[PDB]
Design a protein around this ligand. Structure first.
Ligand SMILES: CC(C)CCC[C@@H](C)[C@H]1CC[C@H]2[C@@H]3CC=C4C[C@@H](O)CC[C@]4(C)[C@H]3CC[C@]12C
Ligand SMILES: NCCc1c[nH]cn1
Lengths: 342, 57, 268, 231, 229
């Protein structure tokens, strides 16, 4: 009786939201950006190849100086690279080799990683002893760690396969906030530029916008037909793009609370692993299972170019803060740095 | 009484999401187009820099 | 005159195929990062050796056969013959090591990484060239194979037995035994799970090796025992170029019949 | 805590041999390159030798090359300096200095207490030998180099050290602008090309000492004469 | 390059030296993924032979490393991609419990038809055969109740039952096996092969059966690249 009545009200509320979104869908992003000229052909060359990982690379993250990056592989090794010289700055042996994510702190003093061990380990890069040591092991998740991002040296947000995201206080080792509401494994998260909000994509084909301080879900974005594997905020923080296993990328708007554009091609039938934006946000770069990275025109949904330099799955990619280069990691155990030439 | 407790929470969450202010898609599209236009010149991937200014020669 | 032009075209095509065929194998391993593995170490060595044969021996052999006169110096003829003996002996012994490489892969697949460790590959490659150099340069220059327009390889009774058995007949006996045991294992797996898939591939690999080299070494031993005039001049030219034609098939039998190389060509 | 203790020094006869030891504790010794730096009595610092992490690279100063041998024992965390044909010019206090080299590292960050031995090229100029100072007043120290220390990679390999009376030198500024760990923010390093300035805002009693500027553009590493601060 | 860049490059080369030394020891070990349910008894199989639980055992100078993931929920469609390069998947089911056999068959179908497990052979184990034999002999529960096709199933003549086994056991035991193999042969196009086995809680031959099956899995890969199969 009460349960039947309540679940009927949820359907009415969903129709209310759908009507509200349809009410503000006066125009389409495609119509708005039809007049603007295309970006042309985007040609990027492999400037650097980072060799030394002996297994599948699963994650990478640039440091804020746009020169150092950290990559994680399932050979049980965290490596910090000097991208200008390809020198290895550090090699951190992981207690658990089944790592799935890695993050570089914006200060550059810490790195984080974690995988099937359900632990987010914090490593101190600046010690008087001259070596990298474990500073914290964040326990509390009941599923695998899928993504992690530092807010500062003391706060980090993690997404897990137990359908929840958590905000952690690194100094005390306790999760201050728990983000619940996803019905599937959360596979990725992206921080807003002001670090007041973050979006997460799960296997329920939905993206939820969370308030860091308040700790609740503000908005829910649907439209994908399969598990979401990747998510990335637009550089101004008013939009984000997702990547799913249905070979499509979708651009959702926070304020319009709906999808604005779909990035898919008929030839593409493989899942998407990673997504990122260029510094101005005009380019959307996506990594695919078909060993390639496709550069999309974010405004016009045109495939601007292709980065074909890997012989296995493109598992991760990231663009530097200054926008100078893009790094791609792959299951072939190599990292490559790309940028164009005049 | 686990299902009935979950139903109340799910309904309560949908109330918060339905009470937000939504701007027009045209208004949202213009802001995204404006940001790309304003920062186009400072995007090295969109407009490659001269080789002298490229750290990855 | 028409026959001379016709033979020249046939020689030109054979030289072109041998050089072009081994370039692809060299490029396929060079371009593809995944192909740079210890399993393809011998195939690269075979492709490199056959490429030199197609550039340093084949172009000069074609001139000698067509013009029927060795315009080059007598001293250079000794080096030319030594290069022919060195490259062909190494090419034959390359095929022998590939069969042993495949024998450990099939008979003992669990312990293959520890019995074919890359240290043993390096040692075997060195021993191939040491035996190839000894029978080619040292033997010719010191008169070991010794009995002006002729620049044919000289051979005696003792040298014919030593070179014939060690280079070809001994590896042929082992390769037939080795590839027969592999054939039994391959057929057994297919019966439990094309039925002639292992038959066609193994017959083509062994067929070309026997067809190209057995008549030559049969004549080479016979020529040493019964004198240089025992072998007919026309017959001596046929068996000589069969051994050269083998280098045109190695890029097909050992590279075009490989899963990685065929997909590697698409990446190029 | 990070420690570097030197031993083996003492009075030796001319032409003799002596073995200096540097025992390291509290840090990963095998990860750090090691230098020997000596200081003659009432004189400035002089670099002696360098051995890299893994013992693959070894450098010597010209005045000691061929007579001194530097070696390390990684399992024992001990650094060695075998000296032969010792001259009266070698009478100095020998310092054990650790230095690690990677992007953003701080070489020469920790110095040992030193051991005393008694026996019976880019030019770095510090023209101002002494500077009278008062607490709370801003002081500037100048350094000059015969060659430009600015490399094509953007780094300017200039270092600043402070040797308080009775204490070993301590790193203040590395690569001409970066502030060493544990150093108050009042110290600031500024320079360009061949001219460099060390600014000390709100001078205190602890800042009293001798200041040395060192170049790390190329070997041999050379020190300036030194500027002394007195009250 | 400057004097510090040369020292940094030397540091980078020392790291690569230690990366190869640590990475060389992992190439000689074969990676196995252990799957099953709570009642499958897969913990008994590993214990007899002996977030992530690991086990290392040696069979004739061959090192096997089996990974059991017991810290995750039922939805394994995401983290299964990590085990894309394992040699074999050791899938364990409980034969006695006919009620959950359909769940095991549905579970095995997802693993076999997985997108990232197209080339991974499955060393299927049907654990707890002694309990199954007693359950069939009692006759309280019949497989025909859960599987209607069992009543019309006849024991093939090519079957080779173990000595001292009742014919009733063989008809039931081979019917359960035929259900799993029928799923295996339906798809895969010969890329990977299932290796069903029957074991019990007191069986000590589990390690050797994995050894022989892993030999066949590696042998098929060698024959595949040589175009002999
Ligand atoms: C792939 C296999 C079939 C290639 C075989 C090439 C054979 C058929 C060709 C290539 C070179 C040719 C030889 C070239 C020169 C001569 C000398 C001439 O006085 C008699 C014919 C003879 C001996 C030719 C016989 C046929 C020949 C040996
Ligand atoms: N043309 C082959 C020459 C040779 C090699 N070995 C003996 N004879």
């Amino acid at each position: 009786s009460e349960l039947d009545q309540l679940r009927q009200e949820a359907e009415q509320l969903k129709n209310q939201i759908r009507d509200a979104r349809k009410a503000c869908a006066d125009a389409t992003l495609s119509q708005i950006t039809n007049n603007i000229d295309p970006v042309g052909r985007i040609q990027m060359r492999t400037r650097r190849t980072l060799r030394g990982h002996l297994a599948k690379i699963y994650a990478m993250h640039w440091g804020t100086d746009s020169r150092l990056l950290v990559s994680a592989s399932q050979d049980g090794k965290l490596i910090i690279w000097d991208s200008y010289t390809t020198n290895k700055v550090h090699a951190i042996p992981l207690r658990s080799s089944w790592v799935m994510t890695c993050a570089y702190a914006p200060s550059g003093n810490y790195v984080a990683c974690g995988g099937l061990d359900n632990i987010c380990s914090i490593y101190n890069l600046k010690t008087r002893e001259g070596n990298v040591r474990v500073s914290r092991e964040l326990a509390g998740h009941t599923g695998y760690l899928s993504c992690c991002r530092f807010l500062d040296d003391n706060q980090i947000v993690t997404s897990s396969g137990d359908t929840t995201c958590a905000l952690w206080d690194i100094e005390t080792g306790q999760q201050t906030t728990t983000f619940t509401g996803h019905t599937g494994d959360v596979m990725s998260l992206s921080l807003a530029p002001d670090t007041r909000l973050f979006v997460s994509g799960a296997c329920d084909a939905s993206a939820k916008l969370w308030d860091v301080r308040e700790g609740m879900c503000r908005q829910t974005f649907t439209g994908h037909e399969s598990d979401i594997n990747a998510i990335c905020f637009f550089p101004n923080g008013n939009a984000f793009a997702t990547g799913s296993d249905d070979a499509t990328c979708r651009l959702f708007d926070l304020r319009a609370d709906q999808e604005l554009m779909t990035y898919s091609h008929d030839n593409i039938i493989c899942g998407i692993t990673s997504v990122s934006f260029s510094k101005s946000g005009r380019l959307l770069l996506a990594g695919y299972d078909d060993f390639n990275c496709n550069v999309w025109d974010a405004l016009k949904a045109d495939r601007a170019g292709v980065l074909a330099g890997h012989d296995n799955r493109v598992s991760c990619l990231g663009v530097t803060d200054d926008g100078m280069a893009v790094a791609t990691g792959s299951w072939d155990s190599f990292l490559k740095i790309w940028n164009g030439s005049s | 009484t686990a299902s009935i407790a979950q139903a109340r929470k799910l309904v309560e969450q949908l109330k918060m999401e339905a009470n937000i202010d939504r701007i027009k898609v045209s208004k949202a599209a213009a802001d995204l187009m404006a940001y790309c236009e304003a920062h186009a010149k400072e995007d090295p991937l969109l407009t490659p820099v001269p080789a002298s200014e490229n750290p990855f020669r | 005159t028409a026959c001379k032009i016709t033979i020249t075209v046939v020689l030109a095509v054979l030289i072109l195929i041998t050089v072009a065929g081994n370039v692809v194998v060299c490029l396929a391993v060079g371009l593809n990062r995944r192909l740079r593995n210890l399993t393809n170490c011998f195939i690269v060595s075979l492709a490199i050796t056959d490429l030199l044969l197609g550039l340093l021996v084949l172009p000069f052999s074609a001139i000698y056969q067509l013009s029927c006169k060795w315009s080059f110096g007598k001293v250079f003829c000794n080096i030319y013959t030594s290069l022919d003996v060195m490259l062909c002996t190494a090419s034959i012994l390359n095929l022998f090591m590939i069969s042993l490489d495949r024998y450990c892969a099939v008979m003992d697949p669990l312990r293959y990484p520890v019995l074919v460790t890359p240290v043993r590959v390096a040692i075997s490659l060195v021993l191939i060239w040491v035996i190839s150099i000894t029978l080619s340069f040292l033997s010719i220059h010191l008169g070991w194979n010794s009995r002006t327009s002729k620049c044919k390889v000289q051979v005696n009774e003792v040298y014919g037995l030593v070179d014939g058995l060690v280079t070809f007949y001994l590896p042929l006996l082992i390769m037939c035994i080795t590839y027969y045991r592999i054939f039994k294992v391959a057929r057994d797996q297919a019966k439990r799970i094309r039925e002639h898939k292992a038959t066609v591939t193994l017959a083509a690999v062994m067929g070309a090796f026997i067809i190209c080299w057995f008549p030559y070494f049969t004549a080479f031993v016979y020529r040493g025992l019964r004198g240089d005039d025992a072998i007919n001049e026309v017959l001596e030219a046929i068996v000589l170029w069969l051994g050269y034609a083998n280098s045109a098939l190695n890029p097909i039998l050992y590279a075009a019949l490989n899963r990685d190389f065929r997909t590697g060509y698409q990446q190029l | 805590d990070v420690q570097l203790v030197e031993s083996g020094g003492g009075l030796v006869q001319p032409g003799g041999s002596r073995k200096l030891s540097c025992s390291a504790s509290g840090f990963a010794f095998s990860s750090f390159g090691m230098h020997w730096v000596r200081q003659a009595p009432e004189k400035g610092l002089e670099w002696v030798a360098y051995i890299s992490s893994g013992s693959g690279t070894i450098y010597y100063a010209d005045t000691v090359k061929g007579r001194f041998t530097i070696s390390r024992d990684d399992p024992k965390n001990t650094l060695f300096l075998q000296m032969t044909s010792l001259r009266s010019e070698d009478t100095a206090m020998y310092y054990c200095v650790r230095s690690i080299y990677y992007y953003g590292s701080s070489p020469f960050d920790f110095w040992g207490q030193g051991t005393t031995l008694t026996v019976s090229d880019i030019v770095m100029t510090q023209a101002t030998s002494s500077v009278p100072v008062t607490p709370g007043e801003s002081v500037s120290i100048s350094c000059r180099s015969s060659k430009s220390l600015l490399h094509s990679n953007g780094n300017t390999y200039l270092y600043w050290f402070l040797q308080r009376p009775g204490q070993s030198p301590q790193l203040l500024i590395y690569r001409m602008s970066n502030l060493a760990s544990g150093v108050p923010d009042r110290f600031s390093g500024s320079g360009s090309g061949t001219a460099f300035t060390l600014t000390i805002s709100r001078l205190e009693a602890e800042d009293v000492g001798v200041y040395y500027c060192m170049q790390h553009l190329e070997y041999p590493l050379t020190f300036g004469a030194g500027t002394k601060l007195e009250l | 390059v400057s004097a510090e860049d040369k020292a940094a490059a030397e540091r980078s080369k020392m790291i690569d030296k230690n990366l190869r030394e640590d990475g060389e020891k992992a190439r000689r070990t074969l990676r196995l993924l252990l799957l099953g349910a709570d009642n499958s008894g897969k913990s008994t199989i590993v214990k007899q032979m002996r977030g992530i639980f690991e086990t290392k055992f040696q069979v004739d100078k061959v090192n096997f490393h089996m990974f059991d993931v017991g810290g995750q929920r039922d939805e394994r469609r995401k983290w299964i991609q990590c085990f894309n390069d394992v040699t074999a998947i050791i899938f364990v089911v409980d034969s006695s419990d006919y009620n959950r056999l359909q769940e095991a068959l549905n579970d095995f179908k997802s693993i076999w038809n997985n997108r990232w497990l197209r080339t991974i052979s499955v060393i299927l184990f049907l654990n707890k055969q002694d309990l199954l034999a007693e359950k069939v002999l009692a006759g309280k529960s019949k497989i025909e109740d859960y599987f209607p096709e069992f009543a019309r199933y006849t024991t093939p003549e090519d079957a080779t039952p173990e000595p001292g086994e009742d014919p009733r056991v063989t008809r039931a035991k081979y019917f359960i096996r035929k259900e799993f193999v029928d799923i295996s042969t339906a798809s895969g196009d010969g890329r990977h092969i299932c290796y069903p086995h029957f074991t019990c809680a007191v069986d000590t031959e589990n390690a050797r059966r994995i050894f022989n099956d892993c030999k066949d899995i590696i042998l098929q890969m060698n024959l595949r690249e040589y175009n002999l199969v």
